[PDB]
Design a protein around this ligand. Sequence first.
Ligand SMILES: [Mg+2]
Length: 569
Amino acid sequence: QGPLSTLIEQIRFESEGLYYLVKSKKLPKDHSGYELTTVEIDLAPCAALGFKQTLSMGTKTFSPLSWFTLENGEVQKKARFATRYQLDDVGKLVSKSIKGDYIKKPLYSNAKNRIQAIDITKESYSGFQLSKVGILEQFMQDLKQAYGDSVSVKLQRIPGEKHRFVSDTIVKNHYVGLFDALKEHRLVICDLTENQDTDAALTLLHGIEHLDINAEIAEVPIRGALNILIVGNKDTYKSDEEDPYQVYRKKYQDTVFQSCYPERLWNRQGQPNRHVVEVLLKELLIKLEVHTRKHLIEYPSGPERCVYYMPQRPKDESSEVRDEPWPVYASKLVGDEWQYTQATQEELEDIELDLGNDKRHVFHGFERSPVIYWPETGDYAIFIDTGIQMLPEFEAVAERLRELKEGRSQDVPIALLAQFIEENPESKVINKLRAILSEWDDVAPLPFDEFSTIAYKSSDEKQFYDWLREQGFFLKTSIRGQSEGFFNASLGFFYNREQGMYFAGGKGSPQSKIETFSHLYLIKHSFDALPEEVENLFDVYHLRHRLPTVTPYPFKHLREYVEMQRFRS
DNA sequence: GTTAGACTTTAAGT
DNA sequence: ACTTAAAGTCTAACCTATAGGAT
DNA sequence: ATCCTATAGGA
Ligand SMILES: [Mg+2]
């Protein structure tokens, strides 16, 4: 049919939401109890697809409230009621207490513990069973063991037509072209913080230099050139006249600006973080494309006669649910350039009727969605995140992994290794077998760990592991194969122009440790036949960094236009 | 004010 | 007491070995 | 025969 998705075809802490204890951490000194990190499996309504049910996987930390207990024995007022859940011994079959001090809040104010989605790192079923896909696999198998096929949940696959994969070579070429485009423009870094003792400017310059891009450090920001400012945190300053950010950015209006904190330029291990450099550079490129109203790299072709509208949220107060008409900014492709203007009241009066039923994605609220419109016929196109998560085919991956664990449970006899050495004298795997047999002793068999010097890469190694498999010793196998395709719906650009629906994801090969699910996007329309060039609007690989994108390319350009207006009007 | 996208905790609406 | 949207946190943004097809 | 370029399994 196509890729898998959380949309539903047919319909353990024991409450609303099925918690699966994943991780436990011990508290610091002078405290008792364990912090819990948990995964929730729940069935929820859909906002974007006709109230058809959806699956939801979500981290729900549980902490002890003895952490919050004061020195005098009193307990802090932060949510001191109505939340009582605790664990017993095993991660399932637990209990609570209506006056229990073990709550759903984290250890701190708004700390967000997070859990991986898929883990097949050493293709270990134990590491797999501690990720969201693994928890969902456990959920399905527990439901199956509990009820037979009487109670079953069937994720609705997506009708798939145009599944445009992307390789690491294509994205690598896209970014070498991108940074080649940046080579034409002057780039400046300036550190403006108080008592510049952190030397973050040197680290950022050295990070840029390894992408072969020239940058020069100066004392103060320079007009005309692309600027990077290391300024302190936003809340460090109290007055907007003394904050270097936005005084240097309202002093100069027609100048491209990117700014950074010091702390962001280093990782946990102390080496430079080289991703920050790339994101800064490509974001400056996008802002420059916005600012000169052209394209510095070849974007695809947009649909003809289309217009892209996008609101912006004021810096004002309640109007309770932003009911007051926001400014709305429009973008059009005209010849060799783009036009960005503000949408007048007459245009939006026409639009709110021509868009009609689907007006309320552009108006009435926060997060007002950009929408394409067509002057010629009043047909339009809306791109909305549906809340649907799309999953790699978990049941097959777990079916493979359980058999891998069963195979590695046995120890290979010396007799089989001797037979394999005798019967295949020209294979390259023999030398490692002879060495590991000489290191071993002829009485006891070899466990799997001493095979760790032998990998499932070469063709003779593949033959060796298949030959071990025919004897019942299923040591290693193939899981992330493109030809066999279990880890799709997490890879590459997808497209269904009959229904506009799409998603993005990883590039090239799946990773053993992937921790986010892609989201399916819906293009609501009044069309009978959607324009073909809606394919082209987001076959671009640098909005999301080094990845396929879920939002059309003119929308980000319009948004970086809008954000550039805070210091002009 | 690394960013987009996904994601989780908190706060406002009911 | 429950709901849902708004506010805010946070992690990846791969890497290298092997076979195969082309020249 | 040899060098590049997909395939995907380890760090
Ligand atoms: Mg920004």
